[PDB]
Structures are given as structure tokens and as C-alpha cells.
Design a protein around this motif. Sequence first.
Motif, PDB file in Angstrom:
ATOM      1  N   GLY A   1       0.796  -1.201   0.000  1.00  0.00           N
ATOM      2  CA  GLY A   1       0.000   0.000   0.000  1.00  0.00           C
ATOM      3  C   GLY A   1       0.830   1.252   0.000  1.00  0.00           C
ATOM      4  O   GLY A   1       0.355   2.301  -0.436  1.00  0.00           O
TER       5      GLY A   1
ATOM      6  N   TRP B   1       0.720   1.906  -6.850  1.00  0.00           N
ATOM      7  CA  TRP B   1       0.180   1.630  -5.525  1.00  0.00           C
ATOM      8  C   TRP B   1      -0.797   0.464  -5.577  1.00  0.00           C
ATOM      9  O   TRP B   1      -1.593   0.370  -6.512  1.00  0.00           O
ATOM     10  N   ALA B   2      -0.750  -0.421  -4.585  1.00  0.00           N
ATOM     11  CA  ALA B   2      -1.580  -1.625  -4.563  1.00  0.00           C
ATOM     12  C   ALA B   2      -2.744  -1.451  -3.601  1.00  0.00           C
ATOM     13  O   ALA B   2      -2.578  -1.579  -2.390  1.00  0.00           O
ATOM     14  N   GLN B   3      -3.922  -1.154  -4.131  1.00  0.00           N
ATOM     15  CA  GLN B   3      -5.093  -1.046  -3.278  1.00  0.00           C
ATOM     16  C   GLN B   3      -5.475  -2.385  -2.700  1.00  0.00           C
ATOM     17  O   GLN B   3      -5.207  -3.438  -3.271  1.00  0.00           O
ATOM     18  N   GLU B   4      -6.090  -2.326  -1.528  1.00  0.00           N
ATOM     19  CA  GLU B   4      -6.270  -3.485  -0.674  1.00  0.00           C
ATOM     20  C   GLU B   4      -7.494  -4.251  -1.159  1.00  0.00           C
ATOM     21  O   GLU B   4      -8.574  -4.227  -0.572  1.00  0.00           O
ATOM     22  N   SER B   5      -7.288  -4.941  -2.272  1.00  0.00           N
ATOM     23  CA  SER B   5      -8.306  -5.673  -3.007  1.00  0.00           C
ATOM     24  C   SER B   5      -7.875  -7.117  -3.127  1.00  0.00           C
ATOM     25  O   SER B   5      -7.228  -7.484  -4.104  1.00  0.00           O
TER      26      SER B   5
END
Lengths: 441, 441, 104
Positions: C5, C21-25
Motif C-alpha cells: 500500500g 500503488w496496490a489497493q487493498e483488493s
Amino acid sequence: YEHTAVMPNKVGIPYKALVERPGYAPVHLQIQLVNTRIIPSTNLEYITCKYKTKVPSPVVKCCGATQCTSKPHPDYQCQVFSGVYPFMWGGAYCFCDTENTQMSEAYVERSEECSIDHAKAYKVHTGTVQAMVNITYGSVSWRSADVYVNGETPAKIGDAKLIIGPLSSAWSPFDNKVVVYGHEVYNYDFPEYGTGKAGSFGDLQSRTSTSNDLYANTNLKLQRPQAGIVHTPFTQVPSGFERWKKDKGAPLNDVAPFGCSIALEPLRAENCAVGSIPISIDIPDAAFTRISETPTVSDLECKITECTYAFDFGGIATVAYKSSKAGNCPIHSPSGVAVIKENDVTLAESGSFTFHFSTANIHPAFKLQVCTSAVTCKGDCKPPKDHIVDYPAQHTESFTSAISATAWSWIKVLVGGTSAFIVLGLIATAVVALVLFFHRH
Amino acid sequence: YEHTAVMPNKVGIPYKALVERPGYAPVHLQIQLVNTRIIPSTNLEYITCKYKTKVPSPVVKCCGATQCTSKPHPDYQCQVFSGVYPFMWGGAYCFCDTENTQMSEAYVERSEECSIDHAKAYKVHTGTVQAMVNITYGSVSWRSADVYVNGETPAKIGDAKLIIGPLSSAWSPFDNKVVVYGHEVYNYDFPEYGTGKAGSFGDLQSRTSTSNDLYANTNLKLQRPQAGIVHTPFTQVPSGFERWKKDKGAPLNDVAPFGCSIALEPLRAENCAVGSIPISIDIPDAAFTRISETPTVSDLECKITECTYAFDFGGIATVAYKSSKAGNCPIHSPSGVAVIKENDVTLAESGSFTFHFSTANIHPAFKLQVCTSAVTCKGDCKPPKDHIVDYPAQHTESFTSAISATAWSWIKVLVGGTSAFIVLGLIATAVVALVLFFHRH
Amino acid sequence: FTVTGEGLEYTWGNHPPKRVWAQESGEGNPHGWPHEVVVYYYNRYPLTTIIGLCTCVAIIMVSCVTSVWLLCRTRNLCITPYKLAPNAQVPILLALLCCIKPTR
Ligand SMILES: *[C@@H]1O[C@H](CO)[C@@H](O)[C@H](O)[C@H]1NC(C)=O
Ligand SMILES: *[C@@H]1O[C@H](CO)[C@@H](O)[C@H](O)[C@H]1NC(C)=O
């Protein structure tokens, strides 16, 4: 009117607050960092570059020997070799077979590329930190100014006064000693001037690019000419600068944590997120309007139509609304649960408006203020998709964000069961110890 | 050889040692420190001086009314006075009765005295410390050199390497805020840029001596020009420099502890007698001499001929020596109980020479080494009968100095009496504990 | 490249750096059944869910064992007075609750 707060040191995302003077319509301010620069105080220890080993034309005397003398030159070497007997073009040159001596002196000096490319050794200190801040408040449009991030220096942004600082963390990407080359800096522990180590980084150390004095340790041995030809053969350690260029570490522009680019002209450390900054802003009194002239909102209720806890503004909610008179009203959510994209909303008499927001909670229970009146919006968010995203998160996650109101129910039933068994055992002990210790006599 | 030591950071006291590299004669070392230059890194924050209020010519527009803009000027006022009848010589200067304009522009800017006097405000940092030192070794005469006080700096004093390690204590007279005025400094906090309190110090705040921006804040107000006379009557607080001069505090140099004097052009505090200094002096080997060359000295007997524990060297004593051959000896006491006036004694055979010394103990016990030998001598000293004098303390006082060898006897017999009485009790308890309990049995 | 994140900046050749950015999915359903719950939180926070689960099994174990110890203690302290005195009447409530054999 003086209003204090704390804002995260994150460049892009604006920071919205609602400064509220009782008796005046709450005016909505926005503080957006656009540069935050960690400028260290540095001094140039020296510069280094490739060397050039110039050889004066050797002196060769026939039937007799000269001697060597020492001259104040970087890494000067003299070596008189005997019995040379040179053979130039147009015959041999020196008459006497044996008793012929060549001086063959060398010396080291800055190459003609030092002025163009040269590493610069710097020693850095704590230095200062400054930033470019963009301010909005009420009807006043965006106005930018450069401020010093320290708790004291104010900045007159337009007509408001702003005091920013200190950073909550004194972290700086630079170690004590740094070296700047080209446009990238390296955290190298460079040799203290005058202790160069003959070919690793310090082999040429000139205090300034145009300094007559010069330190040079190239290990310049001077070999004898062979086979009766005229030349000055030398062996020498290759350039330390070249070795450093080949075995150069990863530049600090690519290795620095918290993601700040290094710029050069003042040697900044630009735009990295460390901690938070206090904000102390004095809003002019003339920007505050009386309450009576501004709509007052009552009989509110809010219903989150859609919400997905995505990085962008993935939440739409509506608010049922009744007012005192028509007008424009600011909106804000104090808590960190959700960030509101809208700043102000036009309000009719007894309408119902909509706003957008970004949240990180499965269950975004947050409080929203509309002209000095709060509403609670509960909602229930739903997972985003598409994984990697190009823009940063617009919200801040908290530990109690991902609990999804069944996981809450589960930890509730677990702790309830655990405590219930324990307390049942306790009451069991009580009743047995009551009927038995007493109440058998 | 390398000799390391530590030394009182005192300004007139010489520090005397003997280097002893075995198999050679001891050689006498003298260090004298002649200033202590603690140089704090400083940044000029802002300068200040008396203001001067330039009142440009008023605009008298007769019939009708002008309005004036906020042109950017330090503490600028402009107020239109309506209903003016300016009545000059040779006619009134306007043809209207009332409905006339008197524009009353006022404007404040730096006075010209600011060129010559200004209380410039700095911000002190840790900085560096350096000192001018004077060495004397062997038969080499006095050799003086300035030296950076930090271990990492060779500072070759002549032909010996002198490394002066970082000063034991880091005390500095200056706090973070200092304001320099004329020939003196003040340890005063200064309301910094744009925080000017409007009348005590920061009425004017100019970033540099010739700066186009000026944060005047002087509470200028404009009044109605009375009775139709052309003028711009302005009422405002007197200069902050006025009240700062009148209620100026004691200058730092008159308050700086540890006898710290202050000089200005580097903003340095000199002669600052705090704590101690480590020393590491690498002497040439050539200045030594083989022990087998050195004279033997034997059957040494030193007698104090008159002593009185004055500051100045108020003790004279005599040593009877017997000798091997003509030659030189150093004489210093290896312990602080005495300080010997005489560096070296160059000595013939079979004779009795006199040396001056200074001490505060009332029965000194110096163990003084003549030519790698030893001799211990002691005796009574008497109070030197002056009260206050102007010579600083040549010797260093230790707690076990004032005890007059009867008081030493008195406390010894008292402590012995207590201990022996308790011991007598302990013996009595043991002997009754056994003779009377276990032997009767 | 494991993108968290906090984001990841990658530079490929002379191309300008790119930030992702790595969204929390994650996978898993936060609601519904327990197995889907635990898989959604394991993909969200692996280490936290492992230690949390270990703590929760630990706390339920110690509570359950302490409770059963307390209860069986009380059971003993209920029956033993009557055990020792066979000829008395064992009150029916005690008979059924601190569940008891009828002694002779
Ligand atoms: C401040 O923000 C506004 C709107 O986002 C923008 O137009 C302006 O350029 C910003 N200021 C600076 C210095 O970039
Ligand atoms: C060193 O000490 C001697 C002692 O007499 C003195 O004359 C000389 O001036 C001192 N050195 C300096 C630089 O003052």
C-alpha cells in the motif's frame, strides 16, 4: 483567528479543515503541500577526477650523468637511468657507449575533463527544511508561498499568516559524508583530504575545481627505457574515479526510503513522507461572516448510496436537508474515516444534496458537518478491484478498518463465550463455597 | 614517540610534563594556551534599527473624492479625509466649501542610521572550537601555532604533530538566540521575522542591511488635519530601538560565566576557562638523547627553605646534588601537589642549587625528578598575608591540602578512638560469648 | 515486484520513473461464512491473522480448561459431602445439577 492542527507530510493530497468561530459561519480552509525539501548545510571538502600523467621531455646527457632533484608537484617522480644509449632518427644520438643517463621525470595533474565531470565530496549537517504550500480558505482563491518548516518562522500567504513546523521526524536521507556526481548523490565515506588510497575514490583531491594545490597518490613508478629508444615509460594505478564509476553503488536517487527525489542546486531531498507537521494558521478576521447571513441546516439525515474502499473517491452519499435560508455551505468530516471531495455545496430551502468521499473502512461510520450541524453516515463498503493503481491513497488506514461487522460479531461471540465460561466457573465456586463453607452449619 | 595527556583549559598556566621513551633522557614538554576561540556557526536572521516615517505629500483634490489603493509598502496607511478646507497663505487652496478631499498617505521605512548601527540578530549553532598554542620542548625555543580543537586535525606545530582532542565540556556562553549590537552581544530571544511585537524590539525587521522587503509593524494611525492646515498628522508607537536601548539588559560579556570575554567579527567567546582538554603530541625522535650519554645523579637531598602558599611562586627550596658530569636536567613534579617554576637546570658537578615552586598544601610532598632520578621533600608553609591579589592561581587545589598535620592528627586520633572503642566492644562480646557460655558448658 | 500500500517506484531504462500503488483488493468475502472470512483476512494481513488465530485458540483453550477445572472442582465439592454420608437424602436439585449417582 488562530487555528492549530496537525497535517500529514504527504505532498499531493490536500488537507481540509473547518475553522469555526462561534457566532460566525465556519470557514473551510485547505492546505496543500507541493514541495517539501530537506536542505542540508554542506561544505565542499574536495573534488576528484581522472588524472593525466604528464611526462616532461627527458634530458639525456652524453659522457656524464645528471642527478635528480625534487619539485613541488603532485606525485613527482625522478629516476636517472644509466647506460641508455638512445637511437633517434638520423643516427644514434648520444655518443658515449655507457655513461649515458636519462632523467625521465613524470608528474600527475587534473585531466582536461575535471572541469566538465568531477565528483564533489561534501560533508553535510542537519540543515533546514522548507516547503511550498498552497492555501485556500472561504472565498479566497488558491495562493501559494514558500515557507520554512520550523515552528517559528511565519509566512504571509496572501493575508493569512501560517506557521508550519517542525517535522515530527528529523530524518534526512543523507549520511555525514556524501558525494555528488552528475545529477545523483551517493552516501560514500570518502577519504579525508590528504589520505587518498591510490586508486579507490581519492586519488586526485583538489579542494576546488581551479585550485593550484593538488593531492595525488597514483603510485607512479617510473620504468627504465629499454632497447635504446627515447621514451618515459611509467606504470601507474588506474584512475580511482574510473573504478568508482564502474563499481558505483546504487544512487541515492534510487535507494532513498520514503520516496524523495534528490535535486541538486541546493542539494535538496524533495517530497518524502516522514511523519507529520503542525500547522498554526491565523485566518483574517475579515473572512468570517456572521452566522445570520449564512444558512443554518437542521433536520439532517445521510444515506450512503454507494461506497467502495478504493484509493480514489469511491463513495457517493446523499444528505436530506432543511435550512434557514438558501445559500452556499461548507462540508467536512472531522474524523479520519472518510475524506470528502466536495468543499462547499449549494443549498436550497429544504432540498437534498449529494457529496463524494473516499474511505478505507468496510463499514464507514463517520461524522459529517454541514454548517455547524453533524450527521452520522454508516454505509457498508465493498471491495475494490484492479489491484495496482497509479495514484496514491486519498485516505489513511487504521487498525480497526477491515473488520467487517461479522468478524466483529465473531470476536464478540468468542470473547463473550470465553468470559462466560470463566464467569460461570467463578459463580460455581461461589455457590459451592457458600452452601458448603457456611450453610452446612 | 607519542605522548598523550590532559590539561586544564586555563589561559596563563603552563602545562609541564616529561616525555619518557625508555633508554633515553627524559625531555621536558611545555604547553601554553594563549586564547580559547570558541567559534559558533551563526546565521543572520534579521537586522533592525530605528524606523522613520516618510509621509509623502498629501493629495488635495478639492471638489470630489479620490480613493487610494494598498500599494505594497511596510505598514502602509492611506485614508481620505472628507470635509477639508485647507487654508494656505494667499488664498485658501480649494474652491469648494466642504466636499473636499485630503488624502493622507503615510509610509514607514528604514532610517539612514541603520547603515551605521543595527542590532543584527543571529541564530547560534554548535560550531567549532580552536585555540592558539605555544610549545616548548627540549632546547628548542618557543613555537606557536593556531590549532583546531578536534582530534581529526594534524596541526603540525613546527616539527611535532599536535592533536588537540575535542574539548572535555561542550558549554557555550551563547544560547540559540543572540543579538549583536555595536561591540557587544546579548543573550536575548528576538521575536523573529514577521512576529514583530509592534513596539518593543521588532518594530522594523529587515532581512539584510540593504533589503527591499521590510516588515515594519509600528501601528501607524492617521488623524484629521486640523482646521484646514495642510499636513499629515500621524500618531504611532515610538521606536522599538528606543525602548530596547533604555531597557537594554546587561551585555553578555558582562554576564558570561567562566571569565569568558567576547570578540565580534567571528562572534567568538575567548579565554573561556571551562573544563579540560586532551592532548596528543608526537615529538621528533631526534630531540631525544641516549640514556648512556646522560649524567648520573645520586644522593639527592632537597630541603624547603621557605614556603608560603601564595598564588605566585611563593616557595623557595634547595637541592643538594652530586653528579657524574656537566649537563642538563628537567625538573618537574609528576603530581599536582607542586608546580615548579624552572623548566631546566643545566648543572655542573658536586653542588647545591635552588628552585622556585608554587603550592597550596600546607605540607607539600613533591616528588621531583632531576635527570631521571627522584627526591621527595616536605615542610611547613605559612599564610601569605595579602588577602586579595591579581595573580591567578598557579597551582590546582585538592581537598587534602588544608589539613595542618595536627588536624590530620586530630581526625586520625578521633577516628581511631571510635574504631578502637567499637573493636573493644566486639572483642568483649566475643570473649564473653565464648569464655562465659561455651567454656562453662 | 511485491507492491504494498505504501507504493513502489520502478524505473526501466531511460523511461521516466513510474509509481504504482496496490489497493487493498484481495480474494475472500469479508462477510458470510467463517472460512471465507478467514481467507479474506489472511490475504489482507497474513502475519496478523496467523498470530491472531493462534492467540484466539490459545485464549479459548486456557479459558475452557480453566472453566472445566473449576466446574469439576465444584462437582467434587458438591458430591463429596453426600458421598461420605451415604444415608442422607441427596436434594433433587443437587441430584440433577451436580449430577450424581444415587448411593446406598
Ligand atoms: C495551487 O493550486 C492551484 C490549484 O490546484 C494551482 O493552480 C496552483 O498552480 C498551485 N500552486 C502552485 C505553486 O503550484
Ligand atoms: C610563547 O611564550 C613565550 C614566553 O615568553 C612568549 O614570549 C611568546 O610570545 C609566546 N608565543 C606567542 C605567539 O605569544
